[PDB]
């Protein structure tokens, strides 16, 4: 094995931020989402298959 990381070349590399952007679901996407949940429940969700 031979492994190095960016901490040895640190203090010259810029910062790294991980943002999380939340976006609410659309109306037709909620109706189609609940429609696929109900129609999936007609097939018993295929969870244990």
């Amino acid at each position: 094995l031979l492994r190095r990381l960016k901490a040895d070349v640190e203090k010259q590399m810029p910062a790294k931020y991980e943002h999380i952007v939340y976006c609410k679901l659309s109306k037709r996407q909620r109706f189609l989402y609940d429609d696929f949940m109900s129609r999936a429940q007609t097939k018993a969700t295929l969870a244990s298959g």
Binding site: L1, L2, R3, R4, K6, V9
Partner: protein
């Protein structure tokens, strides 16, 4: 690590020269290993060198 630096036109940094240092023990000892450096640190510079 005692490298002959001819035909190496570009410039490499110190940790990549240490990559050639740890790469010098592979072909001279007839050993094969996996070089897994952090992405963005120039493994191709070590291979070309």
């Amino acid at each position: 690590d005692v490298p002959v630096p001819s035909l190496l036109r570009g410039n490499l940094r110190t940790y990549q020269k240490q990559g050639l240092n740890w790469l010098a023990s592979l072909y001279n000892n007839h050993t094969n290993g996996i070089l897994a450096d952090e992405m963005g640190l120039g493994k191709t510079i070590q291979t070309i060198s």
